[PDB]
Amino acid sequence: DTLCIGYHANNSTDTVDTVLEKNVTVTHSVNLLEDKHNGKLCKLRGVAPLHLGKCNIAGWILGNPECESLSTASSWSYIVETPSSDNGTCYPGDFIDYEELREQLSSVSSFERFEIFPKTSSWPNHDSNKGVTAACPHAGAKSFYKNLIWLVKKGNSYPKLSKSYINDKGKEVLVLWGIHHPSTSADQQSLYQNADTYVFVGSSRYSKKFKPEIAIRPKVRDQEGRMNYYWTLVEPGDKITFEATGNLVVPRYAFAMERNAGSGIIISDTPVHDCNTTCQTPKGAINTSLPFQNIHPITIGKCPKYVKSTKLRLATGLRNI
Amino acid sequence: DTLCIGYHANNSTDTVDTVLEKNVTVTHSVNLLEDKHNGKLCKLRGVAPLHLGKCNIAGWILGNPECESLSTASSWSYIVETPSSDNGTCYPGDFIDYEELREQLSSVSSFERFEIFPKTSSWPNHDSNKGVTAACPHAGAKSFYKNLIWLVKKGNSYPKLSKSYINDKGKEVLVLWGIHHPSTSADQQSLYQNADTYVFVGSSRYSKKFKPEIAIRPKVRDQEGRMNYYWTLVEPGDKITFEATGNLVVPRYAFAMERNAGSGIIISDTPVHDCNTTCQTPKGAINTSLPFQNIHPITIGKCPKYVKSTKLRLATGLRNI
Amino acid sequence: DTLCIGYHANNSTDTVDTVLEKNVTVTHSVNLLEDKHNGKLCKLRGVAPLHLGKCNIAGWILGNPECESLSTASSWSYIVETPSSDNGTCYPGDFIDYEELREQLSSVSSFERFEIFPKTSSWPNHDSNKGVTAACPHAGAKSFYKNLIWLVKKGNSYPKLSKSYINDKGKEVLVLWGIHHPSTSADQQSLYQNADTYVFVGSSRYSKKFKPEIAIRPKVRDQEGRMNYYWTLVEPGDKITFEATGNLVVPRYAFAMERNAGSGIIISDTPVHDCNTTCQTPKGAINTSLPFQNIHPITIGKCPKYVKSTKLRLATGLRNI
């Protein structure tokens, strides 16, 4: 005498929405939406990313004199460039199938850089010391790509060259080379005597004959000439043959490489740190179990679905009163 | 005396469906599915579309003698072609990266067409008057594109030409040109005396050099020869250089341009009217707030999701007796 | 005298899940998830697939001597290759736009293969009998593609050849040809006397001038030369013209073809049987009305959505006790 029956209430002010009522105060509630990141570029599997810093992919593999300080990590989960990395192809030209390479290079399981064609003992009928440019400066002194050699004629003679590498590694070998297109027919012979030359690269799958296109281009980094960059993957046991009567920028360093496909490239100012994460964005990492997130649409890893919502509050308790 | 409690009913026959029961009559209901359009091609942001009428994109920018009506329009939200516009490249050939242009041209925020290389004062060493064809008729008499000039030799002499334009506009400049491939080596010299010619176009990013491919192609519009069309965008402050010893169809008119990406092209006979719309389809415009529509999958703007449903009637009232 | 009200129960052990409770036993339930296939590769529309067996697409259309016992079928719903089928382009080279062709060949409505350029009466000025190779063996002895002819010089003379076919079929005609690139300039003249040759293929839409690229490639199937393969579709009433002074592997058989777009290619060992199916996967066919399936993501036809779920039991009865 008597017995009343009722429910709970507290000082809570958490509101949620329903199909029939908006802003309903309720005893308890959880959040389904993650909206918090650590503002750090973290490891992703268990392997840290590759940070290029001042340079971009192009400058990194070619060996631009400024990217001099970065190439060792034998594997990475993804690649990071800065929006203010401009050090790439210092000598104007076209990087064929560039963005594609970048994709292939986004994540790698093993990546060792070996000297494919040793500079000293490989080019015995050509000058391998005269190939520098003011476009690729190093120490105010003219320089060039570390991983490429700009073969010019040996004093009035550019004999047909023909070298070839056979992949004895136990994995794919990324090989990069270049074709130089002089601005004038005077520079053509000055560099490679012969006035009509041709370059041929061939493997078991690749085959392409290049013809120099001599003409005056508008000056880019003070060059009226151009230099196009090419790359290919050589299977294990397969060989690749270089042949040229001039205008060939030969490979000096190649890359033994094994690629675990399925990653990407992040262009961000966000500092790279020693932390584990299962999901990465350019603004930072996400450590969450929630089904949804509104931090960034571009994500890498096993991430929550990106949603436009500004709050996803799921009621657990009951009405307050 | 009595009281009995009950619910509403009326002469309504609106039926809806539920998980449990089909065709349940109810007192009140709304429609979630929009199935009604005004059958008009309307403005989209606040700016009207670009209607090409008899011509398509190719014919429009090249200056086909038939597209010689207007379109001066300095901006448009999207582009409209009729399924029965066939006036494009009157001179048989290949429009390189055509589809891409069209997408670049789909929507523009400023678009003025200026004479890049004034016909009178630009070509004092070549004939800029014999360059017409029966393939590009204007009034039964031969003509040509209005934005291109078909330079030929000036009586037995085609000297190396070398012009260049520097973009002083505060915007990108679309530049179009052409490479002509004669059918026979007799027509080659008859047009450009030299038998072995070359054309080179180059800017800060572009560089290509073309070699005429002389051969007999099957007749198209009475031509055994061919003419390939090329285009490029020149950055502000950048310059583009033309150089050729024959076969070059030079730019006459260029286009100062600024492109707000994110639009498309509609191929429809639907009349274009003076009306505002937030969502456009080939069939007509859609003025709705509903989440779904079943009018057309191809949509432009902020539109309802396209759905296969024939009706999406949502019940609001109750069962009606 | 009493009157009780209750519900049903039985020996059922079927469990289902709810938002609130897991593993709830229930009287009756259906399955929404299809997880059973007939492990057969069946007809799709009402038309059986095209099974290539030992060969792949390339070897099939080119006429590789091993695919000799292959194509007659005048139509198919999709194409089946075995993971083991390695008989394709026996003579090393590059099949240009290969993937594209496969996609256009994936499903066809009519497909008859007629002799476009009759071997006996088409080449009276060139040798059409020496064109074999150890790379394309038919019974240990040298052979070549059935649908291509390797024209060589007729004893110290390779006159400019110039053939052309006009499509009088009431459908598209797939035409395949080849460009041969000898390894050495000695083999060049030994095959086609002239040292500087060119080949040109042209139609109303196609036009391309090929120049051989002579060089030593690494040995593939014992050839250090190469042979690139090309194809095109000729529209009814249109013509295609071949012209060459050497290096041209000419068409012998073409294909009158009509292609109902919207199919694919299955690479599976699964046996092909005489059965009807509305949905096909590499693992087998799916005969279901369910909305979901977890058999295979790669599907052809009108199929259930692929889902990762292991079970999707939908309760129909009530709790069991």
Add this chain to the structure above:
Amino acid sequence: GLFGAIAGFIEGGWTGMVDGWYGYHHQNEQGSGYAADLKSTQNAIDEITNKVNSVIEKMNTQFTAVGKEFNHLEKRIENLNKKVDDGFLDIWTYNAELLVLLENERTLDYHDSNVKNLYEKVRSQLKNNAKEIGNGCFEFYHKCDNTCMESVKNGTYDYPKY
């Protein structure tokens, strides 16, 4: 049919009542009359409205131009594009079809609840002073005038009565 009220123990509806969804039909000496429960009807209308304005207003789309152009040598990415369009077609069609089926079932149950709830809210008021016929109708055991009914539908119903 989920709460047993509508189309349940109260078989039909009143074409007579036109002021709201739920109401009463009194029958005393002063006369007969249909009177819709203002508060209850007024609350449902407010909630159902919010329901429709949720299914609609939560669909906020982007400004995009579906449909792309490809050449005869881009049939693959043309089919990729078609796959994206057909994927989004099946997802939205199915979700929209089921969203309506479910929310229709619920909406009808909402009205059923509101009616039954109205029953009960009056039945407990006047426990003994009237008897349950079983047809959603009560038969008073005493004279109930207009201002008597007015206190039942008002929620302010005295029990010092008999």
Add this chain to the structure above:
Amino acid sequence: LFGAIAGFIEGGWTGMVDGWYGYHHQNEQGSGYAADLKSTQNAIDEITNKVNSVIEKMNTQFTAVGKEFNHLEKRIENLNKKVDDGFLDIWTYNAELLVLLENERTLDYHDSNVKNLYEKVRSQLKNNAKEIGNGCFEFYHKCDNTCMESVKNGTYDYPKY
């Protein structure tokens, strides 16, 4: 959700086998399980329609998923993979939840149907019997086979004490 099934009526009757809901009378003539035909028949009609909605509303297009790309198209190959995985996560999740929700509702549907049946007879014979509390009533008068018939029939229209 309605307190009936697994609520104030703890278990179910393995005995009754002619429908989902029914009765078990116990008079002098004998005991017997008899399933409510009309009620059972209506649920079966509605649950069936439910399953035939979840299934029949899934109308798909004729498309061939899976495309081919060469070693220089890894990007659009990954784009394609991204479209396939996006559709995989959307359908898997939606199908998983659609079942969880509609299972919860279906069990509540049966709970409702039972409770509704309890009330539909409880209000037909108010005084003539008492509520045990176990979903069972104890008559205050002789209820023969044709007496029960009129209760399960809905025509119990004559009050008799």
Add this chain to the structure above:
Amino acid sequence: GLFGAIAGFIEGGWTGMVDGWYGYHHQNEQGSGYAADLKSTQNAIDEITNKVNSVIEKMNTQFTAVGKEFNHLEKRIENLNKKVDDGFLDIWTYNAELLVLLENERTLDYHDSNVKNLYEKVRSQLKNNAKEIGNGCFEFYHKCDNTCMESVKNGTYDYPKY
């Protein structure tokens, strides 16, 4: 509001009760006290928890890297890619927005059901021995001591009284 209990015939809640969601407030001679129904509260907590762990745990995603790179001559497939990202954006945003609205409505109805179910479970235990006030409260017709209440909240309540 769907079962008439919470915010229905039982207007407010008890800030006093802090042991569970659902309970009672007895008022005999021994004293007054709030006591939450252990079993009922414990069952809801177990089911609501499972609910949240379903909406979350059923979202199993794949390891993919959204975002791709295209040059100035790939604006189309760049827009195709953008279309795929915006399509998935609208689909997930909408369903997540609605999934919460519906499961919110349902969860509140779940608690309403649990309360009403509790009211009935006691009201049918002691039929005559007490009367229904109408405010979810009963007034005993006999002395109900602490061990009397115990047998009501216990489900083991004997009936030899007046």
